[PDB]
Amino acid sequence: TLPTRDALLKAMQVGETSIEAAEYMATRFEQILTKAKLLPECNDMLEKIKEYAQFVKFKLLSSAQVWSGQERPTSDYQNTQENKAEFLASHLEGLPSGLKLEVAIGDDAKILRGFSSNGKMVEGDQLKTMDGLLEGWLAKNSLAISGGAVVKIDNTGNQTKVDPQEIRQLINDSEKGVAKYFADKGVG
Amino acid sequence: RKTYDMKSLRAQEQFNWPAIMPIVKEDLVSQDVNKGPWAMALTPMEFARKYNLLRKDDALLDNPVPGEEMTAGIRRGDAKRVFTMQLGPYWDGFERCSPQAYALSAVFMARMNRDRDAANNILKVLDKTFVDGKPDFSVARPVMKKYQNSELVQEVVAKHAYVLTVIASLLEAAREDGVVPSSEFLWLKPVDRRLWYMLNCVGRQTPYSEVAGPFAHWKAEKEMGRRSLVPMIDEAIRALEIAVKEVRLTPRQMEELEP
Amino acid sequence: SQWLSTYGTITAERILGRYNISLPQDEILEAINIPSSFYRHLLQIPLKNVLNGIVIQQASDYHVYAQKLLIDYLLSGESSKEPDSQGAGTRESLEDERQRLVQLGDEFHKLELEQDNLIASSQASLMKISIDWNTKLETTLSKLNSLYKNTNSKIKKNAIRKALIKAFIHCDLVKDQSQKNKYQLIDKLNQTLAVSVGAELKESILTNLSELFQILEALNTKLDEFTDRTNHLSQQAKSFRTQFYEVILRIIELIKLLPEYKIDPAQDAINREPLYFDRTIGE
Amino acid sequence: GITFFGNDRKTGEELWFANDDMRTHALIFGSTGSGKTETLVSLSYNALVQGSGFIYVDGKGDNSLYAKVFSMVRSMGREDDLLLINFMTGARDIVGPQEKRLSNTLNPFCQGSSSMLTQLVVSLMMWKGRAIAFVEALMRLLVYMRDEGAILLDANTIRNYFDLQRLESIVIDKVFPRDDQESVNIETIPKLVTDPLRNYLNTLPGYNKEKKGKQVSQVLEQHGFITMQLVRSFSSLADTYGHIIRTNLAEVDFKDVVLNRRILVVLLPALEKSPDELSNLGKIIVSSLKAMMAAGLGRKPTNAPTPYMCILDEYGYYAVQGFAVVPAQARSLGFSAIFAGQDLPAFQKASKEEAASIGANTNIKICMKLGEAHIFFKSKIVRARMFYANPKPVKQLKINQFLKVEPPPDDYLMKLQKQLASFQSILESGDLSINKAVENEEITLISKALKESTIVEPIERGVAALIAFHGQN
Amino acid sequence: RCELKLIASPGSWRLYSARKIDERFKSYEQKIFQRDRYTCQFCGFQARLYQDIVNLDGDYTNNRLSNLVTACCFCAQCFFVESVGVGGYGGGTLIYLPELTQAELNSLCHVLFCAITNDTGYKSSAQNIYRSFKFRSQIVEEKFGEGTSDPAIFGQLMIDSGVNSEEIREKLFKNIRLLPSRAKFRKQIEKWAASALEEIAD
Ligand SMILES: [Zn+2]
């Protein structure tokens, strides 16, 4: 029997705390789909809760060397976006398109990212400098908040180093720029 | 001819049936069970208490049958140690065994090859030496050397592992040539214990609890059909759990035992 | 000769590593053991954190097992029981427990986040304490020399540094602080070295050991807080190990009595592997 | 002689008996105020003093007998040779745990040699013929299914199948249900076993081939009138005694209790009160102690030198067809029996056509006319007091508990004999050490640290490896 | 300070435990610990709780004060590979790694339990290493067949199949190290740790 949507959302909500439980539910539903039917529709339901498991592990862990004396940024937008940066710039990104960056500033092509390397805090540094320069062109417009949040919702440009497989690169750039200035690519 | 009684009968007819010599000079009745040489076996309770196996079972770790409370649970780690220790020494050679286990190896051997009057005179004298001082098992060599390599015995004896299991599994066959009632081993009860309960269990399908190591093995390798020098007592543990969730425990002694 | 357990020495050393204060080479056997020490006090705030670092780990094992019992349930046999049957006979009493396990999920999780702040907030300071000791130790280091190089009594430099460290390790000035206790220290630094008098020099040094004693003191007042927060954060945490052990126990008999569902000994025997610890490890 | 009975009342010269006669059964007649129970005990000494386990069956409702015997055995050292199954105890008062162990467990249905048909038909006691036909076929269906299925025979799992639809579901659906959530199949089993039952319902007056809702009323008239004596027989045995028969490994199984000279005192509730189900409880014994001696006895065992005298106290009430004759097989057992009864006029009155069988098969006949008795021998009649054994009573009467061990599960040995085979082939070929090279990125980076570091003490060396590896990533 | 050899000896446990309850293996048990400072002579461990003494000579009758040595709770079970993971506590999983002498695996596996139990910051790394020790076990299961990874079993198939030689035993245990599993040593690796952090931090 394929569990019904309500039973399934209940199963999600009982496993929204710990990484282990959410991953275990992901494994379970994969398992009892492939043992059973494993329809393409079942394949899509599986993809959805795979996204779920990734996102739980993705928004419950930035130790950030807490013992070393730093702190876990507690606005859970930034925690999640920094683990974004870490995962994607870590194990899904190598040369998506070497050195391309055109993120304009409101129909002006001057304030654009330098298209540096995508190394750890390297592309992060490039995006920090580029976001600072974009602020110089027009500083952080007070849009709203959510905990600690600042927005340029319809900001200038989204895509900087893009390609069909450039999910890692584009998402890393969004994270390192939305550490401060976020166009509100935030859901749940 | 003159009237008789319970006692004087025990003396008048202990010659002709010598398997009761080792008792006729005693009066066991006033003595107490659980103390001395002539002491009853241990129930699984009075056992796990003697070897301190008990523990009050915490839920989620060993799910109890819901209808059960005011009982116990036994520690696997010290149970499996106490049962293994009950397996006899290894078996290396008939000439290398306990000086009594060498005179009950012999009796079955004479019996397997049907040469009955050879076996009988072993046991008939073997008590008369025990009832009088110290018994000598060197009255049973000339049978032991003769059949030490008859075809049946080597078939029975090359098949097993430990010297309790063999001495038991020998009997399993030597009784097939008639009857070897375990009442002819009453010189055996004081001079040895772990044996007298291995012999006295074979033929049953439930052992005592003094000897459940050997009996769980003796069935394990009578199943595979293969010797196994390890211990295989993974079952005699499981039997003890089943026969300890049977005695209901009073609350006062419930709380003395600790997890 | 009063050694230190090699589970301790790994942890007791590696904490000092985070603080970058490995001044002792071999005294680590006698320093972080002697009760009236000073590296012990710099150590007693992050250590207890680690002690709550396992209790909020044991509890979060029940919590991990607790979600699994329900995740198995919620995926298979939830709706196949019609309302008004034996199916809803205890099922409603289960769909209660899902609610209780979903609040203890998002309250307990608030405990981890307060922990991770407590460690962060704590270490972030005690580091700011130790290094500022090192620097201020360096200045007294040189300055105490200029007060001792002037001595007609010839003494070295590294000899005196090893002399002072033993004054903080043979007496404490972290908690029982006074104006006479410093003199027991001052008479303990002198006696470790061979001989000195310096009656005005006993004054002439008191002004110099100040920056230690000050920077020492910001250990007491910052040990004023953190211990007060840690017993809380441990009393709260010890609780969560109990009332998970209940929700994990209530479910194992409530779910036990379904007619047409069961938990097989296959997945249970493997889910029940990390549940063989002890409970009574904090008090 | 070997066995002592007593001294002539007239003259004063004792009368023994010898093995050849005593192997022929004995038979005692006497009132209940005559003192006949001590004579069942005193003459059980005569067979304990030489290593021979009497079986003692009492349906006089005596509770103060097992105190006598355990004060008799214990006096002969072989206190380990005693089993006690007690039926005069409560009715379904035993559930789960127990404050103290009360009785041993008897279960003649577990180790199956397909002689139980010989006993189930006699524990029973066209209609009588169709009764034997129905049961015989289930036993093969069940005793077979026990050899491999997770089915423990007892007075229940057979009693559970006396209904028709679960029997029929074996037939038409060819699937095997039990008293658990389960699905068992009889398709692979040879048809030598399903066939007799399949053709049984067909010999009933009615059958509806598709469904059961119709055909039961076609047959429930005759199904009831043929299965009735057994399902009532099984009804008492499985619920009034759940601490005796619901076991798996009987402490007392009668092939042992004779072939080894063990003792077994058993006590039955009473036999002048409701014999409808207490003359059925003393027949689960003489059924088994007969149908495991005639046809179930597992190249030529010798004649025993010890008579094993089983003493039966009221053979009027229980009885199975022709017990006093013992077949040519078990002559090796050196067997005998001492039938007992309240009164000869009652002995016939007890049941049909039976006191002659015992009257024709016993060379010894005993009247205990109120000088305790006289002996009715073929040649001369002798009047004599019998033996009087007066066991001093025992302070504490422990019935020795056992365990329930098992041959290990076959889900585990067939694996063990399977790996040993594959591990045996490896160890002979000679290419036994592991050889293939695998490379991890972490075993390399945790060994590269342990080889470069120079600190000798192994633990301190270890943590330095973990430091450098962590700082590496 | 000898090295470890995974001795699959048939009847050493019977004697080894047998002594453990007596006093002669106990009266000595105090005498030998003092001489050796509760230090584990095989792998370097140094702790008070749960340490027991192994015999070097392969025999457990002769308990003189010189042949006996004191060794931690991971090495002791490494001397009886014919049953471990069954005899109460203790556990393991045979793996195939040649890069580390068996001592350099016991000792290195302690440090991976004192940085996973009492997390001091390296818990992220320690599990990553330990992930790659257990995972090797699927090779010693590929050569010798399924279900005989666990030393409780792979020990069983030896003396049940009758091998005794110092040679055919050695060549068979070549390049196999006994990785002590965390999840069965949990009643300990926390008892040692929590006892450590309570002496220091009072
Ligand atoms: Zn060690």
Numbering used by the authors:
A (entry chain E): 5 to 192
B (entry chain B): 122 to 380
C (entry chain D): 11 to 293
D (entry chain A): 104 to 228, 239 to 411, 424 to 495, 556 to 658
E (entry chain C): 7 to 208
What do the study authors state?
The T4BSS is a complex nanomachine made up of several sub‐complexes, one of which, called the Type IV Coupling Complex (T4CC), has the primary function of recruiting effectors and delivering them to the trans‐membrane machinery for translocation into host cells. Integrated into the inner membrane, the T4CC is a multiprotein effector recruitment platform comprising different effector binding sites and an AAA+ ATPase called DotL. The structure revealed that the T4CC is made of two parts linked by the C‐terminal tail of DotL (DotLCter): the hetero‐pentameric core composed of the DotL ATPase domain, DotM, DotN, DotY, and DotZ (referred to as “DotLMNYZ core”), and the flexible IcmSW module composed of IcmS and IcmW (Kwak et al., 2017; Meir et al., 2020; Vincent et al., 2012). Finally, the T4CC contains at least two binding sites for recruitment of two different classes of effectors: one on DotM, proximal to a cavity at the center of the hetero‐pentameric core (Meir et al., 2018), and the second on the IcmSW module (Cambronne & Roy, 2007; Sutherland et al., 2012).
First, we obtained a near‐atomic resolution cryo‐EM map that includes the middle domain of DotY previously missing. In the T4CC structure, DotY interacts exclusively with DotZ, which would explain why DotY would depend on DotZ to co‐purify with the other T4CC components. On the other hand, the dependence of the DotZ protein on DotY interaction with T4CC components is unexpected, because DotZ makes intensive interactions with DotLCter, DotM, and DotN. One potential explanation for this observation is that DotY stabilizes DotZ prior to assembly, allowing it to assume a conformation conducive to association with other T4CC components. For DotZ, residues at the interface with other T4CC component are conserved, while residues facing the cytoplasm are not. The facts that DotY and DotZ are not essential for secretion, unique to the Legionella genus, located at the periphery of the complex, do not belong to any known structural and functional families, and poorly conserved suggest that DotY and DotZ have only recently been evolved to play a part in type IV secretion in Legionella.
